């Protein structure tokens, strides 16, 4: 009985009346009782994630026992925990002496048993103690999923989080826990609104206790700013939003803000490809509202283009818009993932960044550098699980869109491309993706905005010496004349800009007479053009 | 009496009776006794999969020892197990030396027993082993023995492999019916021999991860536990285990009963639930597959080798997908290769990949690599009218005996697959000249080996609202986040027929058109409001487009 | 107190007679002795292939020292069996193994030069690093310690020769495996120890049989212990039989029983029971091949002449090639033979020579040289014969193959040799090679031989035995072929309890249809199935025929009907 200084107790808390009302998980408590009532492979271990309530499952089990629902072999069983706060090995003998002389009626419960697993294992092999456990997936797999001599005594129980409405309904046993400081009146409106905005800041947290973390963050931030008598849903929203957003981020949905337009950056930054851009805009209006399916990447498509049409430019253009930053995208080339020697390297080369900053869109410019094993990797990613890491820490793909702007059948127009797509992408890269689009090559109409943005960039580059260019439409079209060449692309235009303008400009800049502050015009000549 | 700290005593524990009965397996015990009684290369090692009964063999050896059956040379000796988990950077070898010290101080015939020694190895034990003071009964698995106790051993001259594969269904039923009083006393309800047979057979048939001797007892113990917990029908019956195995695997309990005639009788609309029309095709395919399972034909031939043709988009691969969904419990079972780039004489061996050391060797062959794994698939040959006249030699050898040889030298068995050769001949002809065309195009004796050469038929304009309803029933779960329902109107249903058929691609745009139109025209209002999860989401057709 | 917890005493172990009586091997022991006694660098190293008696030489030197049979500067030298696995076991700190080894070295060099040391499997002295196994050099190349060693050639090359400054300090004494007579002498020396360990007797003829049989059949191991293993196994097995089972010695046929129990080869002396089978063979083999009497007696003579002990023990057990018309029974005779002497009609190794139309695909049955894609995989044929070295190899239709595959079996035949990429040889010395063809096919026995003489080359036609010519099918044998096929079908109809009652006109019609003179009996299994099995399934799926009903068949005016 000396365990009172070594271990806590639970068979008396519910008897005296000290407990918390946990509701639900009836099937889980049933599973626990059934597994513990076995001849072999008994004493389960509640596997899950930190902050789901495995302790809640155990205390609910104790409550159910003391109220009385158990079979004959469970006559209240004196359930008891173990305080790891008694730490050396000379005292483990003392705490196990009362379990050895026990008659199998003093079953224990260790929390986070992957720390322990020498001293207890032989006793477990003989079966004088049950030792209900609790651990997490990664750690469980790391420690006791490789020693098959101990997988003989441990039948795992998988636990998930309760639903959103379930958390809402269970919240009524928390009305007085935290908000007893500034006496702000709790309202059911803000209560149901708190967990509603669960993916405004971070999706690494969970529902049952991390929603409470959110609520307490909100209470603290209110009591810090207003130092009102009521809690406000949009105010909790501003709490959770003022850090994944500088002006408290985006407000309520109001899709007319950024996504209805979709071309302010795209249509004026990527000249051409109008059909592809309109199509992907329609696609992201149909998709970017949680309005496609259960947890998918919520975006996947492909389209076609040769060199010199602006595929990389569209990729880097949508970056500054889709999430209003530079790292809103990751572009992966498989110039390394081409053989089976490397398919394991990304499980992980990408995982570091994609887990640290899950605010990026995944890009694979070409599959003419890829292997059919990354095919199955991404297939399992799509709709059959978010991700599985070789170490065990899994990272969801919530704000990631799948793109391929390939030159797969660019020589052909509409039929060769479609046949080559249906062929080269064997595993289901057709049925679960979205539409496959096309490009609109450099056209005499689509050259004016090109030259305009090029000259704008050259000007902002020249602004460090306080020079400005007066570009007239004569030269604006004389360059466009000999810069069409729709086999190579805009790089002839850029090189011609550099040569014609910059070579002479940089000769005269050190030849005097163009001292800083001046302004230079453009004047077409028969074969050249002067400044 | 020195360091009994990190071990057990299977003999002393047997002196009281804590151990189980070990019924059966009376040959491996004698083989172990025989190897343990040599002069050199003694101390055997048991080899088998997990949970087959190696520890059980050692327990039975100890029990026959304590009762008295072995020769006197082995009699009067004890056994000890060892724990590779409680020991294990460094100081593990110090502990190992501490143990082998107690062994050398025993200096007798106190046999040891190590479990999964391929974690240990090395050259620390070999001197002590090749001197005659310890005996080493091992236990491990074949593949790990081959990688750890074969490559760097140099003591493979000291180890003898004993094989224990796994029992059969009958031996497992005997194991169970002998190991029956234990659970009947632990929980205590009742157990029927019918339930034992059901456990063995269901486990063997559906559970493929684990193996018989313990995979079977899991079901019995779980059934007893759940029956005991139910009392919060005083016996466990053969139906009282279908429930447990269904809870385990997923398939409902109705399917996990008679499934050899009850499943052939369902080759009715259970296929037609997925494919619409084509009743002659469905009947012919169903009957052809139904008579192959009878059991009177030669056992080396695929399960079905029919080819069908006609217009595209009329449901030609949908029948294949549905047939794979019903028979093989998966719709990702058809492997589809395009017979358009197999036109040259050099690209015929591209679907095997013949030699070692050449360009395409580790990529296997397109046909043989997809069947060596999942040897229960369905094979489609799109556009067979464009193949070089040497593919047919391979495709004719495969269906004369269900075997083939890939490049690595392996042999793959085709006698559980279903072959299907699509085509598109007869763009204009209905049923009269396409037959002569497909007879003249291919060799005449090649068709003589196939099954029915049934010809698909056009889609009745009446039989298109069927496909429309299938599309809408599928779409009835895309707006499942906010429970927003869908509106239905027969004119709009028959509106998609004309502007979606395009009678040169069958019904290919019936998916893209519907999804783009409705999804895009709705996404705006699904956020703007004007409809919530209590409304039909009113929709109809404008003179030009589909109105909201 | 340092070299007594990290070493045992081989000489003290020899004094109590806990060693074995080394027999022979005087050259190697003399060389070890005369190298162990020079001025500097007196470190011999026994080297050789595994199992040929390298430790026995050192134990013999120990027994000789104890007996006093050595030169004057070797008497009372107390050789010591050092071990390193026990000095590296507990040491996890800076400089904890260094002093442990330094104490041993100081104790060896403290006493006078009488501590001859013995490290077995010395390739393990190269590690211990983290400057280790390297402190020993100054004493090695000065004659301070003697260090008799022993290791295998492969381990030597891999570990020690990478340290060309340390190899210099060792003298290689090459140990080669002994011959059959030397092994017989060794066994005669060691017999009386096994005769005491087990409670049985062992016969000198049994020893001779062990040393001889273990040399023809077990070709992956080496002799001195390859031969002892058989004797040990047979003795233990006979003792296990005598006990526990309610004429007392091992003889030259128990060894045959063991050497056939593993390696599968039927080596022995034709114990009664199968001699009757071998005598009654041309008809027990004729229960499946009708006709071709000349091509069955040849195979039967090969098999009998092989197992009777009169045949060249270094050449395959038969290298026939039989060719003739189409659908005559060539492949079927090969399969019937494989079924006769294996009982598993699919236990043979057949390769389809119609797939070798391209010169480069020979690498399927050879492998790939070092440095190419599939190198450690091996070759199909080589790896198929290395295990189960008793099969029947079959080359079907060997005229479609490019005429450069006729050059590899040019020496597979006539010697039973073939080497793969790794350069190791397998022996086709117990197989039966059979390669069929279809040259001629419409000529007499003279113009069909002229096609062989024009397709193959003289040094290839000269390697193989009888070139058998299969004859044409007589119209009186087709009935028996139909009986064979119908019996096969009936035996298939045994998962039910169906039967058949085929009539004489039915059999005659079946024999008449599908025997065309150009394609032999080829279109007959297909016809039997088409005309019986289909409407036997139809009339079984739709009831009206149930298990038990012996259904008859007749010849109703048109094509056959039930
Ligand atoms: N439609 C376009 N809009 C904007 N820039 C374009 C366009 N077409 C070409 N360019 C420019 O042409 C150059 C080509 O680079 P990018 O288009 O970004 O790379 P890319 O399109 O992937 O070409 P490849 O295929 O890699 S050679 C860049 O300076 C682009 O800005
Ligand atoms: N012949 C047998 N008689 C009785 N029980 C048996 C027999 N064979 C197997 N079992 C049971 O099958 C189960 C398997 O136990 P083990 O023998 O420990 O399995 P294993 O082959 O040792 O694999 P490991 O060691 O767990 S990885 C036990 O419950 C045994 O009691
Ligand atoms: N000349 C010999 N005289 C007597 N017995 C011998 C002789 N040579 C070998 N043997 C015996 O045959 C067996 C060979 O064992 P070892 O000599 O230890 O093999 P080895 O030469 O050490 O090869 P490795 O690499 O150590 S496995 C032992 O049982 C020896 O007693
Ligand atoms: N003498 C025979 N006895 C029994 N069956 C025979 C006989 N001759 C032919 N057959 C049958 O004929 C069929 C084919 O015979 P095979 O010998 O396999 O063909 P083949 O002799 O290899 O000729 P090819 O050129 O290789 S097709 C099989 O069903 C055999 O059973
Ligand atoms: N179903 C539930 N009923 C009551 N409280 C719950 C429930 N789920 C989560 N909780 C809350 O979470 C806490 C228990 O979490 P805990 O089991 O300690 O998480 P973990 O086991 O992951 O460390 C309790 O304080 C409780 O308020
Ligand atoms: N009998 C049918 N039942 C159901 N859908 C059908 C049927 N016939 C055609 N379809 C539909 O027609 C379209 C044609 O696609 P697919 O099955 O791939 O045919 P194809 O072989 O012509 O490519 C699909 O949407 C398919 O569902």
UniProtKB/Swiss-Prot annotation, chain A:
The gene is clpB. It comes from the Bacteria. The chain holds residues 159 to 845 of 848 of the full protein. GO terms for biological process: cellular response to heat; protein refolding. GO terms for cellular component: cytoplasm. ATP 2 binds at residues 305-312. Residues 442-531 are annotated as: C-terminal. Its main location: cytoplasm. Residues 255-441 are annotated as: NBD2. Keywords: ATP-binding, Chaperone, Coiled coil, Cytoplasm, Nucleotide-binding, Repeat, Stress response. Residues 1-161 are annotated as: NBD1. ATP 1 binds at residues 48-55. This is Chaperone protein ClpB. Homohexamer. The oligomerization is ATP-dependent. Belongs to the ClpA/ClpB family. It comes from Mycobacterium tuberculosis (strain CDC 1551 / Oshkosh). Part of a stress-induced multi-chaperone system, it is involved in the recovery of the cell from heat-induced damage, in cooperation with DnaK, DnaJ and GrpE. Acts before DnaK, in the processing of protein aggregates. Protein binding stimulates the ATPase activity; ATP hydrolysis unfolds the denatured protein aggregates, which probably helps expose new hydrophobic binding sites on the surface of ClpB-bound aggregates, contributing to the solubilization and refolding of denatured protein aggregates by DnaK. The Clp repeat (R) domain probably functions as a substrate-discriminating domain, recruiting aggregated proteins to the ClpB hexamer and/or stabilizing bound proteins. The NBD2 domain is responsible for oligomerization, whereas the NBD1 domain stabilizes the hexamer probably in an ATP-dependent manner. The movement of the coiled-coil domain is essential for ClpB ability to rescue proteins from an aggregated state, probably by pulling apart large aggregated proteins, which are bound between the coiled-coils motifs of adjacent ClpB subunits in the functional hexamer. It is found in: Cytoplasm. GO terms for molecular function: ATP binding; ATP hydrolysis activity.
Curated annotation (Swiss-Prot), chain B:
GO terms for biological process: cellular response to heat; protein refolding. Residues 1-166 are annotated as: NBD1. ATP 1 binds at residues 48-55. Keywords: ATP-binding, Chaperone, Coiled coil, Cytoplasm, Nucleotide-binding, Repeat, Stress response. Disulfide bonds: none annotated. The keyword Coiled coil applies. The keyword Lipoprotein does not apply. One of its GO terms (cellular component) is cytoplasm. GO terms for molecular function: ATP binding; ATP hydrolysis activity. Residues 260-458 are annotated as: NBD2. It is found in: Cytoplasm. ATP 2 binds at residues 310-317. Residues 459-548 are annotated as: C-terminal. Its main location: cytoplasm. Part of a stress-induced multi-chaperone system, it is involved in the recovery of the cell from heat-induced damage, in cooperation with DnaK, DnaJ and GrpE. Acts before DnaK, in the processing of protein aggregates. Protein binding stimulates the ATPase activity; ATP hydrolysis unfolds the denatured protein aggregates, which probably helps expose new hydrophobic binding sites on the surface of ClpB-bound aggregates, contributing to the solubilization and refolding of denatured protein aggregates by DnaK. Belongs to the ClpA/ClpB family. The Clp repeat (R) domain probably functions as a substrate-discriminating domain, recruiting aggregated proteins to the ClpB hexamer and/or stabilizing bound proteins. The NBD2 domain is responsible for oligomerization, whereas the NBD1 domain stabilizes the hexamer probably in an ATP-dependent manner. The movement of the coiled-coil domain is essential for ClpB ability to rescue proteins from an aggregated state, probably by pulling apart large aggregated proteins, which are bound between the coiled-coils motifs of adjacent ClpB subunits in the functional hexamer. Homohexamer. The oligomerization is ATP-dependent. This is Chaperone protein ClpB. The lineage of its organism: Bacteria, Bacillati, Actinomycetota, Actinomycetes, Mycobacteriales. The gene is clpB. The chain holds residues 159 to 845 of 848 of the full protein.
């Amino acid at each position: 009985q000396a365990l009172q200084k070594y271990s806590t107790d639970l068979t008396a808390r519910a008897r005296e009346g000290k407990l918390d009302p946990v509701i639900g998980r009836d099937n889980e408590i049933r599973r626990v009782v059934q597994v513990l009532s076995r001849r072999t492979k008994n004493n389960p271990v509640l596997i899950g994630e930190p902050g789901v309530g495995k302790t809640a499952i155990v205390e609910g089990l104790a409550q159910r026992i003391v109220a009385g629902d158990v079979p004959e072999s469970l006559r209240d069983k004196t359930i008891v925990a173990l305080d790891l706060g008694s730490m050396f090995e000379e005292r483990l003998k003392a705490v196990l002496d009362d379990i050895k002389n026990s008659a199998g009626q003093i079953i224990t419960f260790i929390d986070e048993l992957h720390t322990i697993v020498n001293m207890i294992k032989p006793m477990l092999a003989r079966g004088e103690l049950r030792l209900v456990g609790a651990t997490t997936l990664d750690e469980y797999r790391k420690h006791i999923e490789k020693d098959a001599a101990l997988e003989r005594r441990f039948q795992q129980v998988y636990v998930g989080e309760p639903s959103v409405e379930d958390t809402i309904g269970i919240l009524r046993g928390l009305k007085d826990r935290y908000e007893v400081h500034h006496g702000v009146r709790i309202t059911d409106s803000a209560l149901v609104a708190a967990a509603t905005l669960s993916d405004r800041y971070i999706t690494a947290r969970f529902l049952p206790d991390k929603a409470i973390d959110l609520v307490d963050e909100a209470a603290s931030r209110l009591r810090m700013e207003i130092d009102k008598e009521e809690v406000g849903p949009d105010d909790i929203a501003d709490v959770v939003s003022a850090w994944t957003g500088i002006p408290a981020g985006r407000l309520l949905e109001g899709e007319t803000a950024k996504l209805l337009r979709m071309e302010d950056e795209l249509g004026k930054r990527v000249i051409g490809q109008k059909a592809a851009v309109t199509a992907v805009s329609d696609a992201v209006r149909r998709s970017r509202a949680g309005v496609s399916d259960p947890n998918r990447p919520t975006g996947a498509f492909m389209f076609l283009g040769p060199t010199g049409v602006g595929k990389t430019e569209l990729a880097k253009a949508l970056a500054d818009f889709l999430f209003d930053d530079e790292r809103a995208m990751v572009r992966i080339d498989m110039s390394e993932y081409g053989e089976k020697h490397t398919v394991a390297r990304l499980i992980g080369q990408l995982t570091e960044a994609v887990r640290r900053r899950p605010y990026t869109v995944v890009l694979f410019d070409e599959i003419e550098k890829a292997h059919p094993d990354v095919f199955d990797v991404l297939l399992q990613v799509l709709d059959e699980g978010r991700l599985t890491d070789g170490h065990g820490r899994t990272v969801d793909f919530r704000n990631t869109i799948l793109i391929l702007t390939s030159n797969l059948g660019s020589g052909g127009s509409a039929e060769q491309v479609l046949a080559a797509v249906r062929a080269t992408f064997k595993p289901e890269f057709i049925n679960r993706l979205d539409d496959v689009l096309i490009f609109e090559g450099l056209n005499p109409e689509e050259l004016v905005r090109i030259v305009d943005i090029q000259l704008a960039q050259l000007g902002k580059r020249l602004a460090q010496r306080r020079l400005q260019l007066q570009v007239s439409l004569p030269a604006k079209r004389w360059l466009a004349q000999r810069g069409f060449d729709p086999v190579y692309g805009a790089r002839p235009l850029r090189r011609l800009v550099q040569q014609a303008i910059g070579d002479q400009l940089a000769k005269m800049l050190l030849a005097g007479q163009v001292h800083d502050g001046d302004t230079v015009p453009v004047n077409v000549s028969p074969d050249a053009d002067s400044l």
